[PDB]
Scaffold this active site. Structure first.
Site, PDB file in Angstrom:
ATOM      1  N   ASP A  87       0.831  -1.195   0.000  1.00  0.00           N
ATOM      2  CA  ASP A  87       0.000   0.000   0.000  1.00  0.00           C
ATOM      3  C   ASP A  87       0.870   1.251   0.000  1.00  0.00           C
ATOM      4  O   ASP A  87       1.107   1.850   1.048  1.00  0.00           O
ATOM      5  CB  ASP A  87      -0.921   0.005   1.220  1.00  0.00           C
TER       6      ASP A  87
ATOM      7  N   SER B 229       1.963   7.526   0.428  1.00  0.00           N
ATOM      8  CA  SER B 229       1.506   6.631   1.482  1.00  0.00           C
ATOM      9  C   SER B 229       0.026   6.333   1.286  1.00  0.00           C
ATOM     10  O   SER B 229      -0.831   7.145   1.633  1.00  0.00           O
ATOM     11  CB  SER B 229       1.748   7.247   2.858  1.00  0.00           C
ATOM     12  N   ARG B 230      -0.267   5.164   0.727  1.00  0.00           N
ATOM     13  CA  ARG B 230      -1.635   4.797   0.368  1.00  0.00           C
ATOM     14  C   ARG B 230      -2.629   5.004   1.511  1.00  0.00           C
ATOM     15  O   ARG B 230      -3.717   5.544   1.304  1.00  0.00           O
ATOM     16  CB  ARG B 230      -1.680   3.348  -0.121  1.00  0.00           C
ATOM     17  N   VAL B 231      -2.260   4.568   2.711  1.00  0.00           N
ATOM     18  CA  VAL B 231      -3.109   4.772   3.879  1.00  0.00           C
ATOM     19  C   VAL B 231      -2.945   6.197   4.408  1.00  0.00           C
ATOM     20  O   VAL B 231      -3.913   6.831   4.826  1.00  0.00           O
ATOM     21  CB  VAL B 231      -2.822   3.741   4.994  1.00  0.00           C
TER      22      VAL B 231
END
Lengths: 284, 254, 229, 69, 126
Positions: free
Chosen positions: B93, B118-120
């Site tokens: 992610d 940062s995907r999250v």
């Protein structure tokens, strides 16, 4: 082919596309200042024409410095080319018009002298041939009246000595950001304004030396201002035609990058099928 | 947990797999090369409390477990369209792309904005950093696009001339030596260097470095108000002003 | 379906399905085909897809997330899956930026069920009509940034006036979004949508502000949005 | 120039004179008798046109794609 | 050859660097413009008909193509080759001082001095 180098080929076109974009953007900023000094060139000339036309009322006939018409046998051309390329046909269209008009003159048996302004014009007429009597170049983004005095003095002197019977300015008039027009105006033999000449008033200057002497100076001062604001305007046309023709180059590059991306993806597949096939068929 | 060079694991697995005469794939890598990194990184995760309670058999009750993965991948020539890099990017992610020409150009923590992500992201970030970092992320990627245009353009207008100054001033500030980690009080000079450009004044770059060094100490001289931030990690309207005074007060020390 | 209903079949990612078929086909020792895919992917696809259709007792209708490897829609995984699809819904990040929030890009989004007669002529032309006024607005969007918007002819800046407006209209608030938002949002028929869009683009509603058409249902919902302003 | 309710000074941009003028004229005539380079001021166009020249050069691009011309 | 080929190797190498500007020639000042012309000529010099091997009198031609722009005069590449077949045969005019350089396969300074004059003496012909 070879996906290996079609990449660097693509990346290469990507880069040039990114450069032409920067050029477009730069010519964009240069563009506004260009029209400003083009506007600042107007007062000096237009005021001087009113003074000429006025004092030309009485004193002109006895001795025209440049007021009266006469038999054409030779003609002069102050040509305004740009010191820099990458601006579409801004120069070619001008030269092509000039050449075509020079031809109508040479067919009548009259010669054509050329005063050259700007590198690109000097180069062009160095190739296609022509009688360049004088030149000025390398002004770039900083044109000055100073540097024009030379070439204009040469063409003027030729008119005084009878070696020229007409004198034109050749430059692009800036209509709008996406329209510049190659123009050939006749300056000297003074043309012919009803606006500045028809009306007159009771008063009159007291000229220190003879008014005939001033009518001469003013006439020369005027012709130089004409040539300058022709240059300064042509320059504002350059910045536009450039930023416009540069957007075109950025979009041409983008199209090539789309075509290349296909040619690549093809090789990418061919490469991966063969490597896979020779391994498995080789094992057997 | 961090897997240093699991792109080297891939070639290692390719070796064993090829010797076992198993049918190869895209880059001679076995067919299940994706499944390799897949089940490994799927292992890393935050597991909920119920799971923790069942596994632990009532031992722990309130706590929630988690394993954070930090895999590393080596890319040839910066090409990420490559097979293995594609797979792991397709799995993890988000990613932190360290660009070459950034690194060996002095700017060391060579994270490339706009491509890093940062995907999250947001949720994972502390309550305070959340507010300060907001703009920096994107606005810094624009400085790079604009500095690229700057190569050919001299005599740019003051508006962009200032943005470029802010750009190279934050890029300089955002970079740091190696073995020196940094407190969550890093947001002190992170936030307020960008907040009111307290470094925009005495901007000129060579100072932008030493500025951070001493600001880091003058706060030491009253660190309770600061350590509060390191404990809670919270940011509040009041906390904002308290910080502001610390920099205004710093404008009388050097 | 056999139960009598019409249903929606979402496939998280059809690409992962076909790719998984390759791993298996590899384990079974089957040979590699073009670009290293299975020789059985032409068939593996035709069965998954041909089972989702409209029988005379019910119907399955499927929306599947697609993945185009290396952005080459020539790759077999896409190029196969494409010869099966009857429509494409494209979510644009730039269309999302502005605020129009069914982020569907009105162009780039294709559906061969509109191209034909088959919807009907009125729907088809309204559809094609928006595909022009909406596109004509792009070409003028950089002849405007660089030049004066005023030197744009009458009918064209009235096109940029109407297009500016259809794009704010074809935005919408969703029910599932009421938790996120607070705005009810609604469901508009095909007919109110045609009426609303055809009505806009062929001389009408020009008096309403552009804001009028953000984020609301049938056209009259927008007309009342004008008074509320 | 003074006139009824107005006076303008039409200034020269540089010291003029028959001596200084013939100097500039002779120079202009000479520069034309001998094709010789001279730098325009623009550097933005300089290094950009150069990069553009190097980047464009030696690409088989038009051949790699199939294009008509 | 070892001596006089050194001049060509670098003259060729510089033309390699400026080849990109050949498209934009005339945009560049005379300084580097001349290096480009020298390069074009020197590569126009290194080209022969199929079955016509050269006599190590090719030495004269190649060597003193580099020494001075005896090609720099009268460059334009069209003539830059017809001069070759002309310098080559007016040496067979006085070739005793030539078969000499051929057999010995060596040069120092006298021979260079002679060579310098052979070309100066040359352009009183053609």
């Amino acid at each position: 082919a070879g996906a290996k180098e079609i990449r660097s080929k693509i990346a290469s076109v990507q880069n040039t596309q990114k450069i032409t974009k920067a050029m477009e953007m730069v010519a964009a900023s240069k563009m506004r200042k260009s029209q400003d000094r083009m506007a600042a060139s107007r007062p000096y000339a237009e005021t001087m024409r009113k003074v000429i036309g006025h004092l030309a009322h009485g004193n002109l006939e006895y001795k025209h410095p440049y007021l009266e018409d006469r038999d054409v046998k030779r003609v002069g051309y102050l040509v305004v080319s740009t010191d820099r390329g990458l601006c579409g046909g801004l120069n070619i269209n001008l030269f092509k018009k000039l050449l075509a008009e020079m031809k109508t003159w040479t067919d009548k048996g009259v010669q054509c002298d050329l005063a050259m302004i700007g590198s690109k014009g000097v180069s062009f007429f160095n190739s296609v041939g022509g009688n360049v009597v004088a030149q000025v170049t390398g002004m770039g983004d900083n044109p000055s009246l100073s540097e024009l005095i030379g070439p204009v003095k040469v063409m003027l002197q030729a008119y005084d000595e009878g070696r020229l019977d007409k004198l034109y300015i050749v430059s692009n008039k800036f209509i709008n950001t996406m329209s510049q027009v190659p123009t050939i105006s006749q300056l000297l033999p003074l043309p012919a304004s009803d606006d500045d000449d028809l009306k007159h008033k009771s008063w009159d200057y007291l000229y220190e030396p003879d008014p005939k002497a001033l009518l001469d100076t003013l006439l020369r001062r005027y012709v130089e201002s004409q040539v300058y604001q022709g240059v300064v305007e042509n320059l504002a046309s350059e910045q536009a035609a450039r930023m416009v023709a540069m957007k075109a180059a950025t979009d041409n590059g983008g199209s090539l990058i789309k075509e290349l991306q296909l040619v690549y993806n093809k090789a990418r597949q061919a490469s991966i099928t063969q490597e896979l096939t020779e391994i498995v068929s080789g094992a057997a | 947990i961090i897997y240093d060079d699991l792109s080297k694991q891939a070639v290692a697995y390719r070796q064993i797999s090829l010797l076992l005469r198993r049918p190869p794939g895209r880059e001679a890598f076995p067919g299940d090369v994706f499944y390799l990194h897949s089940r490994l990184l799927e292992r890393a995760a935050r597991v909920n409390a119920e799971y923790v309670e069942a596994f632990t058999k009532g031992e722990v009750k309130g706590k929630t477990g988690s394993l954070t993965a930090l895999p590393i991948i080596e890319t040839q020539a910066g090409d990420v369209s490559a097979f293995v890099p594609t797979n792991v990017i397709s799995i993890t992610d988000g990613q932190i792309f360290l660009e070459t020409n950034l690194f060996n150009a002095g700017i060391r923590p060579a994270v490339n904005p706009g491509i890093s992500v940062s995907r999250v992201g947001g949720a994972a970030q502390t309550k305070i950093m959340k507010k300060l970092s907001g703009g920096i992320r994107t606005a810094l990627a624009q400085y790079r696009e604009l500095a690229a245009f700057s190569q050919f353009a001299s005599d740019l207008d003051d508006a962009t001339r200032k943005q470029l100054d802010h750009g190279q001033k934050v890029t300089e500030l955002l970079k740091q030596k190696q073995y020196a980690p940094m407190s969550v009080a890093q947001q002190s000079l992170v936030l307020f260097a960008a907040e009111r450009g307290y470094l925009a004044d005495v901007e000129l770059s060579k100072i932008g470095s030493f500025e951070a060094a001493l600001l880091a100490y003058v706060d030491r001289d009253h660190a309770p108000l600061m350590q509060e931030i390191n404990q809670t990690g919270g940011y509040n309207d009041e906390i904002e002003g308290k910080l502001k005074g610390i920099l205004d007060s710093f404008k009388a020390t050097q | 379906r056999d139960e009598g209903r019409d249903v929606l079949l979402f496939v998280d990612n059809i690409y992962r399905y076909t790719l998984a078929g390759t791993e298996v086909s590899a384990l079974l020792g089957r040979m590699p085909s073009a670009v290293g895919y299975q020789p059985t992917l032409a068939e593996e696809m035709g069965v998954l897809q041909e089972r989702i259709t409209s029988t005379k007792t019910g119907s399955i209708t499927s929306v599947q997330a697609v993945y185009v490897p290396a952005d080459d829609l020539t790759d077999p995984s896409p190029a196969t899956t494409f010869a099966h699809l009857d429509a494409t819904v494209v979510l644009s990040r730039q269309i999302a930026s502005l605020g129009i929030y069914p982020a569907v890009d009105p162009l780039d989004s294709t559906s061969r069920q509109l191209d034909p007669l088959v919807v009907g002529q009125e729907h088809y032309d309204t559809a094609r009509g928006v595909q022009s006024i909406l596109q004509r607005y792009q070409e003028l969007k950089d002849i405007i940034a660089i030049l004066g918007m005023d030197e744009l002819s009458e009918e064209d800046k009235l096109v940029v006036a109407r297009a500016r407006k259809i794009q704010r209209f074809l935005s919408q608030p969703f029910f599932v979004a009421e938790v996120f938002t607070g705005s009810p949002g609604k469901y508009v028929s095909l007919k109110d949508t045609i009426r609303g869009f055809k009505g806009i683009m062929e001389g009408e509603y020009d008096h309403l502000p552009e804001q009028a058409f953000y984020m609301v249902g049938s056209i009259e919902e927008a007309v009342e949005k004008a008074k509320k302003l | 120039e003074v006139q009824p309710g107005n006076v303008t000074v039409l200034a020269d941009t540089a010291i003029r004179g028959q001596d200084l003028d013939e100097a500039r004229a002779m120079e202009a005539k000479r520069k034309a008798e001998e094709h010789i380079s001279s730098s325009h001021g623009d550097v933005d166009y300089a290094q950009a046109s150069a990069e553009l020249a190097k980047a464009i050069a030696q690409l088989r691009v038009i051949e790699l794609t199939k294009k008509a011309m």
